[PDB]
């Protein structure tokens, strides 16, 4: 597009030790805007030997970065954090067309995205180690804390800035430095992140962002010798093979895999406040979040108030194209993910479900999906299993409270999870019971950067954000002192 | 006799409060290897038996993780006490069955029995956060909640104290665990989970599955019930396993090799670091994974560390562990001595010297002789493999920067030792060495309230202090809308 | 009574450097059951020179009781524990004949206090120093915790076991010694546990108890040098007056003073919940305790129906001995608590306040007073602004939330409070509002030993117990290593 | 002067709810430079009736400003640190005039106090409260952490910056508001900073300055039921009346006090390290702070040799106005400090004590003392027990460890102590013996804003900087939520 040639953070080499660069073979791979499914540039196509240069640029200017002291990293992390924000409406404008969605959420994401920047050069000066009460008067136990080393992070598209610096700010801010592989989908948010990262004086080789073969660039992040950490954000069956991987070296590992996350309004809740909560919690993204409502269940008592009420809101939303004014709901990222919903719609209307409304592809075409919402939901059907990542609310009836709670939790993820009761007891008793890490208590925006963010099960490993996002990219040194 | 004489030996596996055969009968023997008798036989389980166990465990899960920290504490506490209380008999097994010294395993009881009274402790004390809020209609309420059923597998070095490291945090978190015993040395796991049937443990809450290690440690690192897993051995094992607990992306705990260097630098404390070398080099005949694996020393205190290094070793009593004064027990079995062999005769063929040992112990079975090797450089494979024996390979070096580039010439990082009093280069060169523990003018660093563990390929994880427990925790955000 | 005369632990000599002593004059001053009136005994009434010895043994003993470690330490206080609970029934016996509560809140008490002694036993291991990332890198700053010496402990008569243990225990757990002077009403209480001391190990002169003439020893505890803490649990003015003394020499302060505990019930309160924890937070102890319910506050809607429910409990109470059987209401300390008790009464009765029961002294004589329950108590009265420390629940009408909290507020005061609602925004508003240390929401049993138990205001300074309770005794030592 | 004229920041007028005022009665007061005699300005000389104003408008600022979120009250602060260090010039401009030391150090504590500014609005955000495990599996509890309120602080003149962003800092980013009564020497640089808070957006009365009578000013604040908490920093006999009066109203309080620094070089020792460093600990501020090292202990082994290259440092000083190029050494800040400098070194001379350099008025007058050095130093002169505040440096000889350990804590104060020695052995010992807050292994310039500054004994309670500094201005509050 013209008005991507007309921002200087529009990039189409990638960045290795502070270079622009192509791939040693020249090849380039094209980037499409999935709203008009025309070509809006291209990116480097590298593959194994480019990772490996990066992970070598990682390695030798983490020597010099480490050695700085916190505030050093904290004075460059916050330039960084500044032009973030500075260039919000800029980088705003990439993601909508690179990624879809609307350019109101787009600019959200960058304001959210910038906050973990500020956040973590502020825990850089904080990451505190121990004297621990001696069993014996002859030593003394100092502990302290050291950056793990080159961090390697493959990010996914959905997210395409937020998931750079929520990777990239903790390991910088602890010391380490990083290598980035990502979307091929969204590779122009990352190397716009890059060029505000050459702007902020962040030293060459500190961050890297390699673009093009994704397994040949996956692999050599996950079995070179030097990269002591890997950081991912993804699919879970993409999560068990990069983990799989990471095994022949013992990489350190944070994981933030798939989720299915369950929405239960019991009937004692604030009807008006939990249809507003579920409507935000389901159609953020059109639905393609790892915490978006995968399942609501309602109560029987309130059902048909709350299906009439949320199908009114649903019937509002305005779908176009993420640059248009008032648009709330942009396309589906790719062909297949239009599948998956149509799949999963099919069963469910074979089993007995109905079609509120929507249930099929837009009229604009391209991958845009109709907002849905399916009624008569039961525990039978696949799209009660299965991620939709899609603008489609399944509204499940349910009575008894432990059979909810088992039906919640009768999934292998264990990410984001919203209970809505006015009810104390059941509220604690509830989120408690809830097998997950996330758990919305009459609230469905949970996402900030003080909150730690992250699941349990196969939903993966660590947090990202608040107290506990630095440790995770350090390793702990006991000193034991004989006097 | 002298174990049958034991309430504590038993011959059959535990699970779900019962003494268990397996379901074909099959057993295998287990041998004493200073004297080369079988001691016994254990039941040979398979993945059969290992699920049960999961089973058993995942059901106790739901009303042990119930009680209150307090409740889990003292049933912990009855637990510790009746460990301490049976130390002569613990001491015995072990020392019968892996061939320490006596003296050895009953420092070993009270070493293990630590982290039981300590983790019941950190029960009561799981502290979950109250985060200032950015948004102000909402509360941010950070709790910890168990991870759920453990997997522990052990090895045969601290057949004790790896039990209680693992299982001890695990119960403490409201955790449950099945745990798979080295067949070397099983009859020390199934001794502790007799005092934990006799401290009033529920059933299913600790569980010992003894026997085919391929089959069940399958079973432990697939089983979908099972959320974590906590394995202390060889790298290449751990590699394996956790290759395994990627299709179910299983929270790990890895305590793997260690190729530990001590570096004695020119200005340090020669008595206090021959002293210290000798404890980190000996101690379990040199089957440790924190041993002194390289002994680097300077140039210029070279041949004097040497002669009085070689005067120590040469006081040492070899022979069998129930002996009074022995120092040096047998190693665990033939391949460690064949192995231990290989090593030092490829040192001796690029110029290293034996100043003493070098050969089996003329007391047959699997003993060996504590050895000395000078005149050791980097090109020796003794450098770039663990011994886990009594061989202390000592290198010369003359360069600080060169010795600490060799002592991080390695996959390895869980244990280092420095040697110097000089206060600058004490921390300069221990902040440089890449492990994640550092004897500084120290080398007994054992203890149940620092945190114990590597970087890089010795593993990921930390046993004991305040930091063990949140291993066996996860973390839940509850965000409360006002 | 010669069944304190069979008990090991009945001691009318004080405890000074490992000795059981009498005063250098001889002189005593009688203790008395307040139940019967009855002479049970005498303890030494020793003055300032003793007070001096007890500092000097308690500094000499300071030198080798902090350099144990800190397992060393944890081994004698659990013995110390273990003896505490072992003879439960004697120390139950003995708190109930001096001071008057019944037979099993004493051994409430005891349960209640032993494990202020387990708790802390295990934080000794525990005053975890820091490693702070270093602003200059030839520096690095570890931070380490000292105890701060011999601590001077004033305690009252209401608890007088749990309050020995809640100073002592973390004086000891930190490394201090501690002297101490008890309540003259309640010393046999005090010298029980000080004889367990002695069985359990404690070394001579790590523990000792000065009883007698309080203005004499307690102006040696507020001025001798050595002490360099003090903790104090009993009233605001004297308090202020110990606190006072202190100032010469900038002594450390631990103070849990006076508390007019508000008990608020709206309209959408569980009325049979609030009922029994209002009955519990009023009448345990006879209602004398710093956290007890001085001002119920309760709705409009609910007002008749509640005092209606409350009333009905308070008259199946058991009035009499506390060594009788079922007995729940003992008698007050002295004369005093009487007249003050009739005083604040009167005061609201001349001011329009109706007595639904009660309202004068039993008839067992002595110092019984009926538990009594006002109604149509409004603010312009004494009973408000006055804490009464006995069995009368003041049951005050209110309507508008904001009136409410500022009455609750309008005090010096802020210990406790606590407040009934199901409502969760209400709840949590209130409680925030609420100036005082601890909130009850919908729960009135609230002491333990693992929450932080103090107030804000003029209710004093310092936490009690929890893992706040043992940093009081510490002073932090920051290390600058220049390498 | 009219360099003074020239910048927007010197003001002569109070600073009282965001108004520009001068005193009720219009009288004042008059400021002078130390170095030349000349009257600068003056300032409004206000009592009781305007403290009690100032008090009034910070509570009342105090209920809105509390109710924003950590980052909002962070986003000021940060403007309010841009401010102070975009002003650095001009800052140490009229700091230099009003207090004299040289522009140099005064630009430095410019950057020292800003830090501050930026250290507290992080800690805000991170604050955190408690979840404890419960004993009562009905119950949780949650524990949170709630501003004290108004607070009042009572600053020196040595750090006339420094002194007002330590306590400041933190007071607002926990959500306080301040009210400050400066030193009558220096009340200039308080008002600037006072200036750039206006600029930086901090609302009306959250921070409040009152000038003029000492007394009556600190009697309101310490007595005025709406301050909540007193921080203070001065000399000890003040401290001790300050906590007096505090304690009517049971107020918390945070000292630092006198410190009579020791100062201990073993003749183990890197010498030449010791002499630098000795050097800065000494002549920092010609020697007017409060962890000055006061004692200079030498060992036998090395005490000639440390003498004579110690006084060939104090030599190169350049003694003069502190706007001259190079000048060292300023003058004092009034003329008894060179009367009490006087007199300790006539006492010392009269009992042995040899003069090596200085020992009077330097030829420049005014308030200028010699850089002095005395030798032959020992305990029963009268430097050794007081504060001599000025560029006098007494060389004390010693031999054995335990006795210049007992020589070191033979003292009420525990400020900053400071301890040289290669042996790791020795260098702990010492260390972990020296009754002290603050101890300098191998290195003096231990201030910085992470690190926790205070002391022990009677050099006071609390800490300012690092961690533990926003906890002084924090109560806690323990919900026990009933299931």
Chains 1, 3, 4 share one sequence.
Not at 297 to 304: G, K, L, R, T
Not at 357 to 367: D, P, R, S, V, Y
Not at 390 to 416: K, S
Request: charged fraction near 20%; charge should be negative; glycine fraction near 8%.
């Amino acid at each position: 597009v013209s008005s991507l040639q007309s921002t200087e953070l529009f990039q189409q080499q990638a960045y290795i030790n502070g270079q622009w660069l192509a791939a040693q073979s020249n090849a380039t791979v094209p980037v499409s805007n999935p709203a008009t499914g025309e070509e809006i540039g291209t990116i480097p196509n590298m593959g194994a030997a480019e990772a490996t240069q990066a992970v070598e640029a990682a390695y030798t200017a983490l020597q010099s970065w480490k050695a700085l002291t916190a505030q050093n990293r904290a004075d460059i992390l916050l330039a960084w954090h500044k032009l973030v924000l500075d260039h919000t409406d800029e980088l705003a404008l990439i993601m909508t067309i690179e990624q879809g969605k609307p350019l109101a959420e787009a600019k959200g994401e960058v304001r959210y995205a910038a906050s973990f920047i500020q956040w973590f050069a502020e825990e850089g000066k904080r990451i505190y180690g121990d004297v621990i009460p001696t069993v014996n008067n002859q030593q003394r136990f100092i502990i302290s804390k050291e950056p793990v080393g080159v961090v390697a992070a493959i990010t996914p598209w959905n997210f395409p800035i937020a998931m750079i610096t929520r990777k990239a700010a903790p390991a910088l801010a602890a010391g380490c430095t990083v290598v980035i592989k990502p979307a091929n989908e969204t590779p122009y948010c990352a190397l716009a992140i890059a060029k505000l990262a050459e702007k902020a004086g962040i030293p060459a080789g500190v961050i890297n962002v390699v673009t093009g073969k994704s397994q040949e660039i996956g692999s050599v992040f996950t079995s070179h010798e030097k990269v002591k950490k890997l950081t991912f954000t993804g699919s879970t069956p993409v999560g068990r093979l990069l983990m799989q991987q990471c095994s022949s070296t013992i990489k350190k590992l944070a994981l933030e895999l798939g989720g299915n996350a369950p929405l239960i309004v019991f009937d004692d809740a604030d009807l008006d406040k939990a249809v507003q909560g579920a409507i935000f919690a389901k159609f953020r993204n059109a639905g393609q979040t790892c915490v978006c409502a995968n399942r609501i269940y309602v109560h029987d008592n309130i059902y048909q108030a709350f299906a009439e009420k949320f199908v009114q809101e649903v019937q509002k939303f305005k779908v176009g194209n993420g640059l248009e004014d008032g648009v709330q709901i942009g396309p589906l990222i790719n062909e297949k993910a239009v599948l998956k919903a149509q799949q999963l719609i099919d069963d469910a209307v074979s089993k007995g479900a109905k079609i509120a409304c929507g249930g099929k592809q837009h009229a604009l075409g391209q991958t845009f999906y109709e907002p849905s919402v399916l009624t008569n939901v039961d525990r039978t059907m696949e799209i009660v299993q299965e991620e939709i990542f899609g603008p489609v609310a399944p509204l499940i009836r349910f009575t008894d409270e432990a059979d909810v709670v088992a039906q919640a939790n009768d999934t292998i993820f264990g990410l984001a999870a919203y209970v809505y009761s006015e009810n104390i007891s059941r509220l604690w008793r509830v989120s408690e019971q809830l097998e997950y890490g996330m758990v919305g208590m009459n609230a469905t925006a949970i996402s900030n950067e003080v909150v730690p963010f992250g699941g349990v099960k196969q939903s993966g490993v660590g947090r990202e954000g608040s107290k506990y996002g630095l440790e995770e990219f350090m390793t702990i040194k006991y000193m034991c002192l004989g006097l």
